[PDB]
């Protein structure tokens, strides 16, 4: 029924060690007491959570052992049963917290009034010719931060390594955050007002559910045998921010033939919204059973479900000068292009085109400034790795296979609807990298058109009559039917994209896996090195770092260059000849889309050289990307 | 029990067929096969049940035909000369004929 046992712990000792630690401890070895100074920030309301570094308590115990006084192994208590010590540290803090030194503007808070009226009522009663639960007045959240390696809270666990033997302990868990709740208020202390006796009473909640009070029990209500009625008041309740998250083990950790298991993480208080889905993270936390309550507790039996209370969070992963440190090296255009995907060797004009997606043309009023590029031709050319490199390099980039539109989605996961924003809405004011572009449904394919023509997508279901703004540059790639491209034939013959779509790109670029003894040796020597030496081979130039490349581009974009008179004079002198030669064999004719294209391309080159406007030494290169693309369609 | 539905040649087109629960007791069980046009004589009855009163929100009673005989609507049916529960039965004065 209820026997009792001699455990080698005494919480009266350890409460004395904890209060003795808090008042005494200073990290003066960094050359007043650390936690006293911290508590002053709490008392002045400049701070809302107290982080206790377990690595400090070692230095406390080390100093006390060096003084020859045997501190009572406190870290080995609070790793081994962390939950109870959240109560002891809050008691030790409250007993020691200093009076405020800055003005609070006290009477803006409700509890300062309620508890004062409760104080005065007790004096005016008790003249006669705890006071309330302390959790109600704790304006701060306590968290432990675990040991760094210098011990079980140090070693990060995969989710399957967390056996039932770990329950109650402080642990560290490694994984991806797979999903996250919206933040909701949990109650901690519920305040009620009695209608008749005019007296406040508090219920404290420590479970997934609770039962409300309804009938008054204040001294002056029960003494007057008045059946007072209690009503809940949210204004005087204490809530905490609660957010539930799910963590999954990493693909490296799963043993051969198993499935990636998961834990529920509960994050409470100031630590909330520190987790985002797809983070790889180490969460340290207190591992616990969530006990079923009410009828389910009987039938569920001894089989407790479980969760982790978050305590601290470790993510796994000068600007204004660094752009000059690029510029003052010179030849920025060719070096930035050669620095797109440096692992792919050759194909320079493609890299020199793709760079102009990142930078883009200019919008006007509306008229599109965004640039559309379609890569084309043989498989094994690594177009997917190049699209992937642009997805990592580009600001606001999104990779998405055909293997896409926004739509109403009814009961995803929780039993509620959402208007889901497709990849073309994820790519707002950025690059949409659509790989396997021809493996697409007509309902998505014809929704590419409205992103071109209207800079938007439209919805027409469940009464949702909405348009979503969706300005984005499209990078596309496609692969040929019959396994290899036929040089006897057009792109229109090898690929199912119609000219009414295919001719909407500012650049279409045919790139091919052409066999040739030297070119095949140059490729095969690179591949056979990467099987001997696990890092990339010697580039024989130094590339721009992607972070410094992004930092350049964000600054280069906003300069929005304007026309100079010789540009508009010159561009017609090319365009007319391009029309005249298109008069004279596929579909590659000089549409006005190609005039607009040369404009947007020349704008993207003008941005890269950082000026208010630029001379036609620029424009002549934009014409070369187009001219080389057409010669690449023929060969 | 037999769920009995309206005959699709009497159901007005584009409007739903109605049904009733029919109950067959001793010696009437196994008399009709799913998909026959059947003619029932019986007692139309009703009883309380809470599921109606719950979902419909009014004091409304379910209804049941306790069957007392069954006939199968074979022959030409627009015919007064063909009495009885079985139009292909003969009498002794008919077998002799």
């Amino acid at each position: 029924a209820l026997p009792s046992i001699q455990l080698p712990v005494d919480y009266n000792n350890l409460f004395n060690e904890i209060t003795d630690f808090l008042v005494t401890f200073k990290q003066d070895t960094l050359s007043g007491p650390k936690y006293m100074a911290m508590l002053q920030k709490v008392a002045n309301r400049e701070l809302n959570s107290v982080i206790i570094d377990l690595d400090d308590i070692l230095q406390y115990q080390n100093e006390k052992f060096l003084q020859g006084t045997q501190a009572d192994d406190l870290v080995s208590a609070i790793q081994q049963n962390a939950n109870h010590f959240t109560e002891l540290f809050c008691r030790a803090i409250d007993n020691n917290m200093p009076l405020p030194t800055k003005e609070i503007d006290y009477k803006d808070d409700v509890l300062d009034v309620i508890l004062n009226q409760r104080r005065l009522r007790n004096e005016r009663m008790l003249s006669d010719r705890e006071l309330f639960p302390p959790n109600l007045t704790r304006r701060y959240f306590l968290y432990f931060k675990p040991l760094s390696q210098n011990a079980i809270s140090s070693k990060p666990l995969s989710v399957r390594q967390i056996k039932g033997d770990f329950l109650g302990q402080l642990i560290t868990v490694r994984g991806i955050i797979t999903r996250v709740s919206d933040v909701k208020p949990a109650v901690e202390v519920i305040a009620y007002t009695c209608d008749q006796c005019g007296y406040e009473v508090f219920q404290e909640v420590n479970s997934r559910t609770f039962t409300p009070l309804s009938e008054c029990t204040s001294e002056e209500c029960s003494q007057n045998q008045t059946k007072g009625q209690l009503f809940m008041s949210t204004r005087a309740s204490k809530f905490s921010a609660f957010q539930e998250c799910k963590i999954q083990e990493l693909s490296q950790q799963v043993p051969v033939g198993h499935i990636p298991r998961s834990l529920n993480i509960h994050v409470n208080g100031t630590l909330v919204r520190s987790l985002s889905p797809g983070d790889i993270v180490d969460v340290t936390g207190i591992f616990l059973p969530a006990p079923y309550t009410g009828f389910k507790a009987l039938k569920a039996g001894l089989l407790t479900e479980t969760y982790l209370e978050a305590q601290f969070v470790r993510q796994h992963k000068d600007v204004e000068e660094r752009v000059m440190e690029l510029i003052t090296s010179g030849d920025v255009y060719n070096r930035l292009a050669k620095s797109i995907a440096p692992e792919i060797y050759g194909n320079l004009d493609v890299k020199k085109a793709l760079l102009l997606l990142l930078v883009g043309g200019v919008d006007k009023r509306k008229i599109r400034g965004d640039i559309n590029v379609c890569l084309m031709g043989d498989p094994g050319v690594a177009k997917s790795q190049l699209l992937k490199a642009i997805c990592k390099i580009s600001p606001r980039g999104v990779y998405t296979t055909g293997k896409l539109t926004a739509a109403v989605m009814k009961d995803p996961v929780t039993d509620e609807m959402i208007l889901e924003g497709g990849a073309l809405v994820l790519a707002d004011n950025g690059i949409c990298c659509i790989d396997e572009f021809d493996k697409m449904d007509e309902s998505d394919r014809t929704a590419i058109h409205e992103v071109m023509e209207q800079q938007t997508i439209s919805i027409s279901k469940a009464g949702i009559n909405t348009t979503l703004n969706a300005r984005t540059s499209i990078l596309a790639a496609a692969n040929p039917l019959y396994g290899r491209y036929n040089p006897r034939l057009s792109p229109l013959d090898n690929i199912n994209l119609p000219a009414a779509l295919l001719s909407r790109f500012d650049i279409l670029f045919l790139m091919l896996d052409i066999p040739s003894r030297d070119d095949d040796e140059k490729l095969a020597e690179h591949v056979t090195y990467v099987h001997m030496h696990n890092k990339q081979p010697d580039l024989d130039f130094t590339p721009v770092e992607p972070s410094k490349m992004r930092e350049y581009i964000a600054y280069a974009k906003t300069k929005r260059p304007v026309m100079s008179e010789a540009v508009n004079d010159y561009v017609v002198q090319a365009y007319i000849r391009l029309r005249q030669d298109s008069k004279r064999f596929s579909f590659g004719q000089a549409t006005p889309r190609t005039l607009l294209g040369i404009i947007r391309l020349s704008q993207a080159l003008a941005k890269l050289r950082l000026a208010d406007m630029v001379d036609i030494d620029d424009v002549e290169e934009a014409l070369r990307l187009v001219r080389v693309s057409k010669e690449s369609l023929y060969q | 029990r037999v769920t009995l539905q309206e005959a699709p040649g009497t159901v007005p087109p584009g409007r739903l067929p109605r049904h009733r629960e029919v109950i067959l007791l001793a010696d009437l069980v196994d008399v009709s096969k799913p998909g026959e046009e059947v003619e029932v004589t019986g007692i139309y009855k009703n009883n309380y049940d809470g599921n109606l009163n719950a979902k419909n929100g009014f004091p409304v009673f379910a209804t049941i035909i306790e069957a007392n005989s069954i006939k199968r609507r074979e022959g030409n049916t627009a015919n007064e000369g063909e009495e009885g529960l079985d139009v292909f039965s003969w009498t002794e004065e008919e077998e002799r004929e």
Partner: protein, 616 residues
């Protein structure tokens, strides 16, 4: 009280006599004291020989087998009281002192009539210690089960405790404790629950199914549910062939409760598992002796080995030496490179045999399926794209959304044998691309969003679209598949049954010798119930060549590989085909038991690929 306390001293005298059990207890205790306290941890479990116990006291041994709920408890108490006499440690921690962590028994050998399977296990076996043999399915998720709660009585300083009882925790029946914590003391003090001083044990439920090979005519496989706990948890995964020892036991009221009116339903029945032994022979790996190692090493020196070992694959199948060579290299698969920037390179050789009917395509898939350490059979019509990848389910123990593994996930680090591969539906073939490219499957259904490992080598068989290979038509006319999927295979062998008087005589004599086989010890007409190696040795050779050798690619082989790649490409060959040459060369270097890929390995890789391309 009385008989329990005697059976305790009766088992204590066994542990004193067979001193190897004290030595095993000592070995566990010092190893845990080293790795936990002085510096990955061993369970408090001892496997006793049931044959030592038979010879010490036949009346205790027959008690353990026929009345285990009365003889295993005092035997585990005797073993626990032994380990506490041996245990010494200065200043033990509160969780150790509070642990409720006694010693558990496990058993070896000689079960006799108590050796069973899911079909022969019968109500006459209830409450007996049984060994059951089967294939694992439906492993449920691990949950911690509460077995002791510790409480602290503030205003007194006493730690209280409560123990908990459930019909799957104990061998004997006890009044079931209701899973509710003490909130208030006997005196009326408030109680706080001490997690970490409290005790929980891991718990898992597994379904063990009859091996389909043993199922009687026209009957489908039976199954039993087995309960596993503490350190037996996750010692199994679905598709494991296994032998489980445990007490077969009944549960519940079985409709004897006036809450039910049916009177035809029966009691629930389970095995409480005491031990688990994995198998793979039709024993999950071969343990290798110093003699096995001597033979494997000495045999690897003979220049003919690539012929000796590949001819010892499927010796009943005549011809196809070049396909059987490719199968040997698929079994001794190449090395995987986990390169940075996500650049993971596959080690796994994929083989497609497309060809005329009756050429041993299916009888070489059924050979791979037998000789490989992990192999999963599938067929094109029998496979859904769901059952290849992973299927959504509810775990009936916990009421929760879960994935079951499909054939491509169960085959992780093994082989998938896909027969009838061209009969797969287009929607099911989508699932094969992901595994062959990315060695993984991606799930996005039911509010499960995940990536599963599927690091398996596909061997597949097909026929051309016209039932025999039409030599007057192109490969892309003859072969039904997208050329994208055909590029994910390393070796696309095309095979024909072509008439030739000497070959037809040669294969005809060979199958007539093959049908004349008489298995040793059978009678004439009784119904069944210069160098080659035996298949159990070939299985050891393959296992050694995967656990001991990881060849490094070397300049001698590079000078050959790029010479032969550039020759092939300058007169379907693509960038992927260079990586096939490196896989075949890395695989052959393992057959030679060598740490470096030499010029010989690169030449054999190029000849074997050139055979598959040109039909040399």
């Amino acid at each position: 009280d009385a008989v329990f306390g005697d059976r305790v001293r009766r088992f204590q005298e066994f542990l004193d006599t067979f001193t190897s059990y004290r030595d095993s207890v000592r070995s566990i205790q010092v190893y845990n004291s080293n790795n936990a306290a002085n510096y990955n941890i061993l369970p408090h479990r001892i496997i006793i020989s049931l044959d030592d116990l038979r010879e010490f006291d036949r009346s205790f041994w027959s008690g353990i087998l026929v009345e285990p709920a009365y003889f295993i408890p005092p035997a585990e108490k005797a073993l626990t009281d032994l380990a506490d006499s041996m245990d010494d440690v200065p200043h033990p921690n509160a969780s150790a002192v509070s642990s409720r962590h006694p010693w558990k028994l496990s058993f070896k050998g000689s079960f006799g009539a108590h050796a069973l399977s899911p079909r022969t296990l019968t109500a006459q076996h209830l409450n007996k210690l049984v060994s059951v043999e089967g294939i694992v399915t439906k492993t449920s998720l691990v949950r911690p089960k509460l077995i002791r709660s510790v409480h602290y009585a503030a205003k007194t300083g006493r730690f209280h405790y409560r123990d908990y009882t459930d019909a799957t925790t104990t061998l004997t029946t006890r009044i079931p404790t209701p899973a509710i914590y003490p909130t208030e003391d006997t005196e009326g003090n408030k109680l706080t629950t001490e997690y970490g001083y409290s005790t929980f044990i891991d718990h898992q439920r597994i379904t063990v199914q009859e091996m389909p090979e043993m199922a009687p005519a026209g009957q489908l496989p039976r199954s039993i549910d087995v309960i596993l706990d503490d350190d037996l948890v996750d010692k199994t995964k679905p598709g494991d062939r296994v032998n489980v020892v445990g007490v077969f036991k009944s549960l519940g009221a079985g409709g004897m409760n006036q809450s039910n009116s049916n009177t035809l339903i029966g009691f629930k029945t389970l095995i409480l598992g005491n031990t688990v032994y994995p198998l793979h022979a039709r024993a999950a790996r071969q343990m290798l002796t110093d003699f096995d190692i001597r033979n494997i090493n000495k045999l690897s020196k003979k220049k003919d080995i690539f012929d000796i070992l590949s001819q010892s694959l499927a010796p009943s199948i005549y011809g196809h030496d070049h396909i059987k060579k490719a199968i040997l290299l698929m079994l001794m698969g190449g090395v995987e490179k986990n390169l940075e920037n996500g650049s993971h390179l596959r080690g796994d050789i994929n083989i497609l045999m497309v060809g005329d009917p009756s050429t041993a395509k299916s009888q070489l898939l059924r050979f791979v399926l037998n000789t490989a350490s992990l192999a999963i059979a599938t067929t094109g019509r029998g496979s859904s794209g769901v059952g290849l990848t992973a299927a959504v389910t509810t775990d009936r123990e916990t009421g929760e959304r879960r994935l079951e593994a499909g054939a491509m996930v169960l085959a992780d680090r093994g082989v998938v044998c896909i027969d009838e591969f061209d009969k797969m539906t287009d929607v099911d073939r989508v699932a094969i691309h992901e595994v062959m490219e990315q060695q993984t499957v991606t799930i996005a259904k039911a509010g499960i969003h995940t990536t599963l490992n599927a690091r398996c080598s596909v061997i597949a068989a097909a026929n051309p679209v016209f039932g025999q290979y039409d030599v007057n038509r192109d490969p892309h006319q003859n072969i039904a598949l997208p050329d994208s999927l055909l590029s994910r295979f390393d070796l696309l062998f095309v095979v024909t049954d072509d008439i030739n008087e000497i070959r037809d005589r040669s294969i005809s004599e060979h199958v007539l010798r093959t049908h004349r086989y008489l298995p040793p010890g059978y009678l004439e007409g009784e119904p069944v119930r210069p160098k080659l190696v035996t298949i159990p040795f070939l299985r050891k050779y393959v296992q050694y060549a995967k656990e001991r050798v990881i060849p490094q690619l070397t300049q001698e082989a590079i000078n050959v590989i790029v010479k032969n790649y550039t020759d092939l490409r300058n007169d379907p060959i693509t960038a992927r085909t260079l990586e096939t040459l490196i896989r075949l060369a890395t695989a052959h270097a393992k057959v030679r038991l060598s740490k470096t890929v030499n010029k010989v390995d690169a030449k054999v890789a190029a000849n074997l690929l050139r055979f598959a391309l040109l039909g040399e």
